Structure formats: C-alpha cells, structure tokens
Amino acid sequence: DQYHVLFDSYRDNVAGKSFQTRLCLPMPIDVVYTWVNGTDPKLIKEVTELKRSKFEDNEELRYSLRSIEKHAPWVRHIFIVTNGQIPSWLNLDNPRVSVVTHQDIFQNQTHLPTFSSPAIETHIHRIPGLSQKFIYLNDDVMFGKDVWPDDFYSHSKGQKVYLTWPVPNDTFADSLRYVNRLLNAQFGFTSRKVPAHMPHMIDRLIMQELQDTFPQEFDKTSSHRVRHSEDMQFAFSYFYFLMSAVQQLNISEVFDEIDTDHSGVLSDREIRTLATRIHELPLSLQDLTSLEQMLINCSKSLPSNLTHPTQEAYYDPSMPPVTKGLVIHCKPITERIHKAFKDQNKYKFEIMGEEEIAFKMIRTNVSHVVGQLDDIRKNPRKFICLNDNIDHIHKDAGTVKAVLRDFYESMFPLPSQFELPR
Amino acid sequence: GSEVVVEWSRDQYHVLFDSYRDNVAGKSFQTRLCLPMPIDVVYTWVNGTDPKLIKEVTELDNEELRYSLRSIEKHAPWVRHIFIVTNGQIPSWLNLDNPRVSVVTHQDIFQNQTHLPTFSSPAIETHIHRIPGLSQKFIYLNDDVMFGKDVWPDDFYSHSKGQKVYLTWPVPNDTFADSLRYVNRLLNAQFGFTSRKVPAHMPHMIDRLIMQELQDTFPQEFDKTSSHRVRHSEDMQFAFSYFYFLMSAVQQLNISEVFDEIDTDHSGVLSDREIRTLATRIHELPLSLQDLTSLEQMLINCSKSLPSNLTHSPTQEAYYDPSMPPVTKGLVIHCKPITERIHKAFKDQNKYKFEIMGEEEIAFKMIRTNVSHVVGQLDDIRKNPRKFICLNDNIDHIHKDAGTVKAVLRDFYESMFPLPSQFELPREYRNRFLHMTELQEWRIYR
Numbered sequence: 083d084q085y086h087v088l089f090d091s092y093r094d095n096v097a098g099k100s101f102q103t104r105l106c107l108p109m110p111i112d113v114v115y116t117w118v119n120g121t122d123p124k125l126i127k128e129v130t131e132l133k134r135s136k137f138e139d140n141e142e143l144r145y146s147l148r149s150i151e152k153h154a155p156w157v158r159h160i161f162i163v164t165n166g167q168i169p170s171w172l173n174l175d176n177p178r179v180s181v182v183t184h185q186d187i188f189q190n191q192t193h194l195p196t197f198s199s200p201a202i203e204t205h206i207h208r209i210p211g212l213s214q215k216f217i218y219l220n221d222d223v224m225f226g227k228d229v230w231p232d233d234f235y236s237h238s239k240g241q242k243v244y245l246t247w248p249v250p251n252d253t254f255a256d257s258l259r260y261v262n263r264l265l266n267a268q269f270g271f272t273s274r275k276v277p278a279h280m281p282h283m284i285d286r287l288i289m290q291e292l293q294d295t296f297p298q299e300f301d302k303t304s305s306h307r308v309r310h311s312e313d314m315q316f317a318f319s320y321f322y323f324l325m326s327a328v329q330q331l332n333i334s335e336v337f338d339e340i341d342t343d344h345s346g347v348l349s350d351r352e353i354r355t356l357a358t359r360i361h362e363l364p365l366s367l368q369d370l371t372s373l374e375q376m377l378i379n380c381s382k383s384l385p386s387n388l389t390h391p392t393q394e395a396y397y398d399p400s401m402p403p404v405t406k407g408l409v410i411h412c413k414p415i416t417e418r419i420h421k422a423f424k425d426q427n428k429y430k431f432e433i434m435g436e437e438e439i440a441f442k443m444i445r446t447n448v449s450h451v452v453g454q455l456d457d458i459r460k461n462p463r464k465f466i467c468l469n470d471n472i473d474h475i476h477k478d479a480g481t482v483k484a485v486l487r488d489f490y491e492s493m494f495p496l497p498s499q500f501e502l503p504r
Numbered sequence: 505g506s507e508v509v510v511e512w513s514r515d516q517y518h519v520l521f522d523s524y525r526d527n528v529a530g531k532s533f534q535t536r537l538c539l540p541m542p543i544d545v546v547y548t549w550v551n552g553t554d555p556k557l558i559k560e561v562t563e564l565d566n567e568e569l570r571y572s573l574r575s576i577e578k579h580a581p582w583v584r585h586i587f588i589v590t591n592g593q594i595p596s597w598l599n600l601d602n603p604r605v606s607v608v609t610h611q612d613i614f615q616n617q618t619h620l621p622t623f624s625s626p627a628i629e630t631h632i633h634r635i636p637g638l639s640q641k642f643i644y645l646n647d648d649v650m651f652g653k654d655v656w657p658d659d660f661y662s663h664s665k666g667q668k669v670y671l672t673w674p675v676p677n678d679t680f681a682d683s684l685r686y687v688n689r690l691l692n693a694q695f696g697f698t699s700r701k702v703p704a705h706m707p708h709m710i711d712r713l714i715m716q717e718l719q720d721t722f723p724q725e726f727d728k729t730s731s732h733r734v735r736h737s738e739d740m741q742f743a744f745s746y747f748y749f750l751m752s753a754v755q756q757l758n759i760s761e762v763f764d765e766i767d768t769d770h771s772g773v774l775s776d777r778e779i780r781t782l783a784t785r786i787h788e789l790p791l792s793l794q795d796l797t798s799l800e801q802m803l804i805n806c807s808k809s810l811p812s813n814l815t816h817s818p819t820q821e822a823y824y825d826p827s828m829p830p831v832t833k834g835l836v837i838h839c840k841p842i843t844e845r846i847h848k849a850f851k852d853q854n855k856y857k858f859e860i861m862g863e864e865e866i867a868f869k870m871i872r873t874n875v876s877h878v879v880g881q882l883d884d885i886r887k888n889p890r891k892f893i894c895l896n897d898n899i900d901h902i903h904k905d906a907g908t909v910k911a912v913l914r915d916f917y918e919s920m921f922p923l924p925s926q927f928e929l930p931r932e933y934r935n936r937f938l939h940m941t942e943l944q945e946w947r948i949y950r
C-alpha cells in the first residue's frame with residue numbers, strides 16, 4: 083500500500099539502490115534524564131552520614147517532559163535514571179517512559195549507593211535498549227523552540243558541538259583541569275572551550291571508545307560517591323574526544339579512489355593522480371619517476387604473494403602491474419601518503435555558536451529574574467536552562483520560585499502524557 | 505492439529521512505516537526527517553557540428569555531457585530522471601532505451617512557438633522549469649559542469665536552512681555583466697537596493713514553484729528573454745534571478761499564527777501570563793509597567809471600538825484589570841495599534857529560507873591554450889577533489905597547442921570517469937537519426 087510507495091520511492095533512482103539511510107536523519111533517538119528527589123528523607127539522611135564519614139526543586143523534570151512533547155515529538159523513548167526513586171506524578175503505565183536504576187547500569191555495585199552525578203553519567207550509555215544516538219538532559223534543561231535531529235547531528239558534517247567560554251567560578255573547574263591534562267597528554271596541548279549547558283546527543287559507540295581510552299579514570303569517576311576534583315566530565319570529555327580522536331588513512335580505500343576503472347591495477351594515468359596526492363604542485367618528472375621507481379623497487383623486495391583481466395601498458399617497460407597489494411605493502415609510498423595526509427579526525431563534527439542556547443543563573447533578585455525570563459519570552463531559544471541558584475535564607479526566595487512557575491506555566495501549560503491523570 | 509496466530513513478521517516496508525510512527529507523538533515526521541525526493545537533473549545540450557543548426561543561425565567539443573552523465577552515476581546516484589533539453593538534436597551515444605534519460609525539445613517547453621527556433625541559452629533556461637513530469641526541486645547543469653566528489657541533496661537544500669546559495673564576487677570581464685546590470689535594476693525596483701554577488705558556475709537546484717513565482721513577478725521580462733533568439737544584454741540571468749528572488753521575496757507576518765504561539769494553552773483567549781509574552785515581543789526590554797498597561801489599554805479600547813462580532817466560554821479568564829475583555833484572536837488581529845507594533849517589531853520576513861555558502865567546493869577553471877597552465881589547473885583537481893567542477897572551454901583553435909590541450913582534457917575526463925554510464929550506447933552502436941522529428945516519423949512508418 084502506502085508502505086510500498088515509500089519503499090519503492092527510495093529505490094527510484096539511476097542506481098536502483100536505496101539511499102534512505104543517507105537521505106534521512108538517524109532514527110531512533112531516545113532521551114535520557116537523571117533525576118533525584120532531594121526531599122526524600124532517607125536520601126538526606128544517607129548523604130549527611132557519608133559527609134560525616136568523609137531541598138525542593140521547581141518541578142523541572144515535569145516541564146522538561148512537556149517541552150519534549152511540544153518541541154521534540156520525534157523522540158522514541160524516555161529513560162529516567164534514578165537511585166530507585168520515581169516521581170509521584172510519573173505515569174509509568176505509558177510505555178514511552180521508563181525508570182532505570184543506578185544498579186541496572188553501574189558496573190561495580192560497590193560504587194552504589196551513589197550521590198555523584200558524574201558517576202551516574204559515566205554509565206548512562208549502558209542503558210539496555212538505548213538508541214545508538216541518544217540525547218541526555220539534566221532536568222533543569224528543556225526545549226524552548228521546535229528542534230529536530232539536525233539540531234544535533236548531520237550526515238555531512240557530523241555531530242554539532244556547542245562550545246562556550248569557561249567560567250572560573252565553576253566548581254567543575256578542578257575537574258576541567260584534570261580532564262584537560264589527560265586530554266593534553268593524549269592528543270597534545272590545546273586550549274579548550276566548555277560545551278554549553280544544553281541537551282547533549284551522545285553516540286554509544288563513541289562514548290565507549292572514550293571510556294576504553296581512559297578506562298581507569300572513568301572507573302575512578304564512578305567510584306567517587308560524591309563529586310570529586312578528578313572526575314571525568316560527561317559533556318566535556320565526550321565532545322573533545324569526538325573532536326580529538328585521530329585515524330590514519332586506509333590505503334586500500336585510497337587505492338580504490340585512484341583505481342577509477344576498478345580494475346585492481348593502477349594505470350599510468352591513475353598513478354599520476356597518486357603522484358599529485360603525495361607531492362606539491364607543480365609536478366616534476368622526477369616526482370613521477372621516483373614514485374615509479376619506488377613501485378619497481380618494492381615489487382622486487384616484497385614477497386610475490388603480497389604483490390599479486392587486462393594487461394596494462396606502462397611508459398616504463400620495467401614497471402610491474404601496480405596492484406593494490408604492492409601499493410599497500412610499499413612502505414616508502416605508504417609513508418609519504420601518511421606524511422601528506424597527516425593523522426586526521428576519525429569523526430566529523432561542526433562547531434556551533436551559543437545563539438540558540440539560553441542559559442540563565444536564577445538567583446534571588448526578583449526584578450533580575452523577571453528580567454532574565456522576559457528575555458526568553460521575547461527571544462525564544464531552542465535550548466533553555468534555568469539554573470536554580472536560589473538562596474532559601476533570603477526572604478524573596480519564595481517569590482522568585484513563584485516567578486519561575488509563572489514562566490514555566492506560561493510556556494508549557496498542558497500536562498504531558500507522562501504525568502498521571504491528576 | 506490446528507491454531508493460527510497474527511504474523512509477527514513485518515516486511516521492510518511495514519518496518520519503515522512503523523518506525524516513523526514510533527515516537528512520543530505517534531506521528532510520522534518523515535517529510536521533515538528526510539531530504540526532499542524525487543530530485544531530477546536537467547541538462548541543455550547542443551551539437552555545433554549539426555549542419556541544420558549552422559544554417560539557421562546564419563540565416564537569422566570534448567563530449568562533456570557524456571562524462572557529466574558518468575559523474576552523476578558515480579557521485580549522484582539518488583537522481584531520479586535525467587532530462588536533456590535540445591532543439592531536437594539527439595546525441596549519437598545517448599541510449600534512449602534507458603527510461604532514466606529522455607530528450608525534451610524546446611517545443612515541449614517554450615510557450616510562444618514564434619520564439620523558436622532559438623539559439624540563446626537564457627531563452628531556453630526560461631522554460632526548463634516547464635518540463636513535464638519534472639520534480640518540484642531539480643538540479644540544472646550545463647554540460648561543462650560535472651561532479652568531482654560524492655554529492656547529496658543536502659549539498660543543495662536542507663529543511664532547517666532552506667536552499668544553499670553559492671555566491672562569488674562578480675567579474676567585470678564576464679559577458680553577462682550587461683545582463684547582470686539589467687537584472688539588478690529590476691531587482692532594485694522590486695525589493696529595494698542590495699549589493700548582489702553572482703551565483704557560482706555549478707549545478708543549480710531550482711524549485712519549480714519558486715521559479716514560477718519569480719517569472720510571475722516579472723512576466724514581461726521573461727517573455728522578452730524568451731523572445732530573443734540570440735543572447736541579449738537585457739536577458740534575464742537564470743541563476744542570478746532565481747536565487748535573488750528566493751532570498752529577497754518577503755512575506756508579511758501571519759498575526760493569527762503569532763496569536764497561536766502566544767496562546768500556549770490553546771484556549772483561544774490570551775491570559776495575563778500569555779499577554780506578557782506579547783508585551784515583550786513588541787516592546788524593548790526591560791518591560792516597564794507602562795509598556796504592559798499600554799498594551800492592556802490598546803486591547804480595552806479595541807473591544808469598544810471594534811464590532812462585537814469581530815471581538816467574539818470554555819473557561820473563565822481572570823485579569824488584573826477588571827476592565828480587560830476576553831483577549832480573543834479576533835480582538836488582537838483587528839486591533840490596528842497592536843498589529844502595527846507587531847509588524848514593526850518583526851521586520852519583513854523572507855518568504856523562503858536560504859543559506860549562504862562559500863566557494864570552497866566549487867572548482868571553476870577557464871581552459872585557455874597554455875598547456876602548462878592547463879595541466880596545473882587539472883592537477884589541482886586531481887590533488888584536491890571538489891564537489892562541483894566546471895571546465896569552461898576558452899581554447900583558441902588557431903594556436904598550435906590547441907590539439908594538445910584538447911587531448912589533455914579528454915585524458916583528465918577519462919582519468920576521473922573511465923567507466924561508461926548506463927546512458928551511453930555501446931561504442932559500436934549509434935542512434936540512427938540525429939533529430940527527434942526523423943525518429944518520430946520513422947516509428948510511425950515503422
């Protein structure tokens with residue numbers, strides 16, 4: 083029927099092959115939250131006891147889930163990672179939402195019970211059934227305008243990386259120095275901006291490569307049951323590993339691009355294209371002859387089996403059939419290719435501005451808070467984060483909270499399918 | 505025994521249909537998640553050796569198209585159909601048995617037959633959007649343009665940023681500069697003055713509806729371009745007009761949609777909290793109580809002045825001002841002082857989205873007769889592949905190296921695309937007639 087129409091359409095091209103995976107954005111895409119209820123009396127008690135041995139929110143999770151229904155309807159499933167706690171309002175009868183406990187994902191149960199968000203965020207990529215590319219949100223992060231997968235990833239330019247300038251006041255600044263040193267030690271020194279406070283798309287395969295590259299440091303982050311100065315940063319480590327990981331060129335794939343006839347043997351014309359790849363222009367005759375003599379030299383030295391339909395005519399009658407095996411095993415040639423194309427990024431990425439991110443630090447100046455929120459009302463942003471820095475000692479703290487509620491209810495007044503009928 | 509069960513198995517078509525509804529909304533967003541398809545390619549091709557052609561002009565190559573079609577098979581395999589627009593001429597090598605390629609004659613697309621026969625590409629380019637069966641978004645190439653790297657529909661268009669526009673700095677030598685001047689005047693008069701760059705020499709994606717809107721905007725000038733059987737200084741430039749119409753066409757804001765965005769509960773009446781958002785949209789921040797009350801008074805005055813049927817309960821809405829009427833959609837739309845400040849606060853909005861692009865992926869080379877410079881130009885493409893390649897023929901046949909330069913090009917073409925395409929007849933075979941009219945008559949007679 084109409085299902086047959088779509089399946090036939092993507093093959094309706096000169097190649098007769100479907101390119102739907104390239105023409106369409108990656109799906110599925112799941113969402114992962116981490117959530118905690120700080121009013122839980124058992125939790126408060128167990129935290130302080132650990133502090134001796136070594137708090138109500140703004141219902142951000144609720145409103146963030148409304149922002150998904152409104153602005154990210156393409157999301158498949160929503161995982162809420164907790165210690166076992168479940169929000170009272172959560173409608174777990176809805177199959178689209180589920181709760182994953184720290185036990186379900188943590189590798190060393192002795193690290194649990196945990197009270198460290200970086201430790202949890204070390205294992206959120208281990209959620210069973212999680213989509214290869216998922217989007218991780220802190221509950222204070224939400225969508226303020228319609229978003230699409232292309233706001234996080236494109237096929238041509240890879241993942242989008244939203245970078246901001248660090249703040250010296252950040253408590254994670256010690257953690258940034260610890261991660262910066264590990265990254266400088268691994269890839270060389272660079273000055274690094276910090277990923278913006280926003281929903282982060284994470285690729286499970288890349289994340290595991292990052293954690294396999296620094297296995298002890300992620301285990302050390304997981305083992306700290308409270309935030310530590312030597313913790314690995316979720317967004318900072320991932321996005322800079324994505325941008326720093328290098329890969330060497332695959333010679334056999336370089337060969338195939340040169341071997342435009344797909345014969346498996348490089349003609350003189352194709353050898354020339356190889357010559358331009360490893361030599362500066364203009365090309366000299368000797369650049370070409372030296373490349374030729376490298377192939378002739380290598381054919382004699384290399385064993386016959388490694389060197390391996392139609393005979394090829396060469397200007398030099400001494401020229402052997404320039405087979406793939408010969409080019410790959412000819413180190414003088416492969417080394418100059420790698421020299422010409424120095425170690426290159428394994429992954430594609432696109433640096434982005436902060437234009438679509440609206441980060442506000444909510445203190446207790448009521449008139450300042452109304453001024454901050456009125457800015458979001460006037461100029462909508464795709465990614466909004468109202469960071470709760472309210473001081474309960476101050477008298478106007480309750481007023482500021484009522485202003486946030488007024489703002490949240492102005493933007494997302496409709497209950498979502500994840501709130502119980504109530 | 506006996507018992508039956510519903511089928512767990514889903515064909516890959518049901519798998520795809522189910523996957524696109526597998527989201528919190530239960531709705532398919534495939535049109536937004538996937539690039540627009542189908543996408544066709546359109547060429548213009550002419551054979552200069554044709555004696556009938558040489559005759560009609562006076563009375564008034566490197567087989568690049570072959571290699572360009574090879575570049576599509578290698579680098580743009582997603583293309584649905586390839587239309588070749590001719591005066592009637594049929595390439596000898598073209599395999600008209602392939603249903604992917606077809607030959608369209610100027611008669612099929614031109615509106616006034618008296619303009620034909622034509623010898624002006626700007627005239628033909630005026631009607632290529634009239635091809636029957638053409639995809640709404642298509643890619644128009646001259647035969648000298650080819651793909652030198654893997655290309656994809658997102659190299660021309662995205663859902664988020666609209667069509668990509670590749671602009672270059674104008675060249676005073678270019679012959680179309682007189683045409684550029686003529687078009688610039690019409691554009692200045694229609695959209696106001698802007699300084700305008702020229703679209704690069706490359707494949708151009710055209711939307712048939714946008715192109716028709718452009719030609720509906722300047723109907724006499726495209727008829728005048730069509731009427732000129734040879735290129736003229738008052739000819740409309742194909743790419744320059746389309747892309748600057750796309751970027752300049754403005755759309756007036758839809759006030760009811762602004763209302764709907766502010767009406768976040770969808771109740772149809774703006775609450776006080778929703779009104780505050782509208783106040784920030786039309787006032788500079790910070791928002792003073794004067795700014796808010798001013799908007800509150802504009803709504804109060806309008807409910808009195810306007811007809812009661814235009815101002816128009818699901819829920820009782822409580823306002824800070826007891827004088828505040830229910831702020832309905834009709835009240836906000838008809839209230840001139842509000843909509844004026846709305847339209848002032850939001851500048852005139854481009855009807856179409858677009859993305860300005862650099863020229864990095866475009867490799868435009870003008871081939872003269874200096875062999876050394878040509879080999880250097882071609883070696884630059886061999887060393888640094890580019891998505892869009894244009895090798896413009898400016899070779900002088902008088903020069904002795906002309907035959908050599910022509911041999912270097914075909915060597916470069918063969919080095920990049922040695923495999924024959926599905927659109928080429930075998931080398932030994934050849935279409936019997938070089939004109940469609942000869943082929944049409946011969947098949948009626950059989």
Ligand SMILES: *[C@@H]1O[C@H](CO)[C@@H](O[C@@H]2O[C@H](CO)[C@@H](O[C@@H]3O[C@H](CO)[C@@H](O)[C@H](O[C@H]4O[C@H](CO)[C@@H](O)[C@H](O)[C@@H]4O)[C@@H]3O)[C@H](O)[C@H]2NC(C)=O)[C@H](O)[C@H]1NC(C)=O
Nearest residue numbers: 118119120121122123124141143144167168169170171172
């Ligand atoms: C975060 O943790 C806090 C602390 O654990 C938690 O607050 C507690 O919530 C429960 C309900 O979720 C409260 O219990 C209520 O108590 C009142 C009287 O004090 C009762 O009237 C309520 O009864 C209703 O609900 C019952 C259960 O369905 C029904 O059987 C009954 O008929 C009524 O309909 C209810 O039992 C408890 O008092 C608070 N305690 C504190 C200290 O706040 C909070 O819910 C957690 N937040 C989230 C988002 O999960």
Ligand SMILES: *[C@@H]1O[C@H](CO)[C@@H](O[C@@H]2O[C@H](CO)[C@@H](O[C@@H]3O[C@H](CO)[C@@H](O)[C@H](O)[C@@H]3O)[C@H](O)[C@H]2NC(C)=O)[C@H](O)[C@H]1NC(C)=O
Nearest residue numbers: 551552553554555556567593594595596597598934936938
């Ligand atoms: C572009 O146009 C030219 C001219 O129309 C095409 O070449 C011409 O092709 C015709 C048909 O094959 C040739 O006619 C043949 O002539 C030979 C020798 O006179 C004769 O033995 C055959 O029986 C037939 O009559 C014609 O000679 C030839 N002319 C020239 C100058 O080459 C050419 O094929 C066209 N190219 C494309 C790509 O369509």
Ligand SMILES: *[C@@H]1O[C@H](CO[C@@H]2O[C@@H](C)[C@@H](O)[C@@H](O)[C@@H]2O)[C@@H](O[C@@H]2O[C@H](CO)[C@@H](O)[C@H](O)[C@H]2NC(C)=O)[C@H](O)[C@H]1NC(C)=O
Nearest residue numbers: 615616617618619620621622727728729730731732733734
């Ligand atoms: C269709 O075109 C004819 C011809 O237009 C002329 O010839 C073209 C090749 C080109 O050179 C044009 O600039 C010419 O104007 C139109 O017939 C002309 O009509 C006008 C107005 O009645 C008259 O002054 C001319 O003498 C006519 N010329 C001829 C050759 O008939 C015709 O009106 C056009 N019709 C439509 C619907 O576009």
Ligand SMILES: *[C@@H]1O[C@H](CO[C@@H]2O[C@@H](C)[C@@H](O)[C@@H](O)[C@@H]2O)[C@@H](O)[C@H](O)[C@H]1NC(C)=O
Nearest residue numbers: 189190191192193194301302304305306307
């Ligand atoms: C699992 O963890 C065990 C305990 O490690 C200790 O406790 C944790 C909570 C941290 O405080 C850590 O600093 C302590 O060293 C280890 O003894 C055990 O080896 C770990 N398991 C594995 C397989 O490594």
Ligand SMILES: *[C@@H]1O[C@H](CO)[C@@H](O)[C@H](O)[C@H]1NC(C)=O
Nearest residue numbers: 331332333334335336337338
């Ligand atoms: C290199 O590419 C070829 C195919 O082009 C593939 O078979 C091979 O596994 C690749 N090798 C590496 C190391 O990626």
Ligand SMILES: *[C@@H]1O[C@H](CO)[C@@H](O)[C@H](O)[C@H]1NC(C)=O
Nearest residue numbers: 371372373374375376379414
């Ligand atoms: C080839 O081998 C000879 C002898 O070992 C050596 O002198 C020459 O420099 C070599 N050339 C290349 C290109 O490897």
Ligand SMILES: *[C@@H]1O[C@H](CO)[C@@H](O)[C@H](O)[C@H]1NC(C)=O
Nearest residue numbers: 446447448449450451453790
């Ligand atoms: C913060 O409060 C002070 C008075 O307490 C006021 O002057 C100021 O306007 C407020 N902040 C801003 C940014 O307006």
Ligand SMILES: *[C@@H]1O[C@H](CO)[C@@H](O)[C@H](O)[C@H]1NC(C)=O
Nearest residue numbers: 756757758759760761762764
């Ligand atoms: C504005 O949008 C509404 C809702 O889709 C529609 O009914 C109305 O015709 C639109 N108005 C204009 C001028 O486009």
Ligand SMILES: *[C@@H]1O[C@H](CO)[C@@H](O)[C@H](O)[C@H]1NC(C)=O
Nearest residue numbers: 364873874875876877878880
């Ligand atoms: C041809 O080009 C080369 C390289 O740019 C230059 O050195 C040479 O002088 C040119 N010769 C002529 C006749 O233009």
Ligand SMILES: [Ca+2]
Nearest residue numbers: 345347348349
């Ligand atoms: Ca070969």
Ligand SMILES: [Ca+2]
Nearest residue numbers: 771773774775
């Ligand atoms: Ca409302």
